[PDB]
A = this chain, B = another copy of it.
Amino acid sequence: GAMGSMERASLIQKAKLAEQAERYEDMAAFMKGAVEKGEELSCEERNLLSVAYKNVVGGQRAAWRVLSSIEQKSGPEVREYREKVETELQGVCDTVLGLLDSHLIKDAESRVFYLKMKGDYYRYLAEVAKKRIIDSARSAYQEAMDISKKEMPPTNPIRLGLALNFSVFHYEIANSPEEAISLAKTTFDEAMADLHTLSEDSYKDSTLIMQLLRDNLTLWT
């Protein structure tokens, strides 16, 4: 590995510097090297891995949507460049899914965290695809839902975030707005019903995500 000679702690340190510098490609490479040391990631380290790669693919997805939009309005130049960006985007998704399967997927919260990630990056592959991909995303999301409902409180931010992204999967990908609405409403309603389970160290993230669930419900209705 390109990061094989660097100590794990230095890779984490440099991932944090790259974040401060908004160098998310470097940040993703440092975290990949840390994962490849073979040790589990702490909560803080999981977030760094998520922040790093989600920013990389985010920029690629935004670029792909622009080029795809230009392509629909319509020489081979637009298609060719859209394909170039598409292939690069698929490469990053394959890298993340490879890390998840090879190192990270094996604590309920951590298991849900990584299964949510797998559903996200299969969802990103489905946006440009197929169905062999969507069923992989659903299977990952669904398994993550099963664990979170049994093991984590209804206000837990990982549980809430999983349901939000899973509901987006139902709406945008599966074209199933009914399942997207019921899930988002059930998630929000069950968080409010057991609002007392908010945690002192994560309530800001819980309330943030609860509001984002409400925002999507407002749009979808």
- Taking Cβ atoms with an 8 Å cutoff, the residues of A that contact B are 10, 13-14, 17-18, 20-23, 26, 59, 62-63, 66-67, 70, 75, 77-78, 80-81, 84-85
Contact B67 A13 (CB under 8 A): no
CA distance A153 to B211 in the complex (A): 57
CA distance A22 to B64 in the complex (A): 11
What is the interface of chain A mostly: helix, strand, loop, or mixed?
A: helix
How many subunits of this chain does the assembly comprise? 2
Closest to A59 in B: B22
Contact B17 A70 (CB under 8 A): yes
CA distance A219 to B83 in the complex (A): 47
CA distance A67 to B27 in the complex (A): 14
Residues of B within 8 A of A17 (CB): 67, 70, 77-78, 81
Residues of B within 8 A of A59 (CB): 22
Having A14-B81, A18-B81, A23-B63, one finds 4 other A-B pairs with CB under 8 Å, namely A13-B77, A14-B77, A21-B67, A26-B81
Minimum distance in angstroms from A34 CB to a CB of chain B: 13
CA distance A67 to B13 in the complex (A): 12
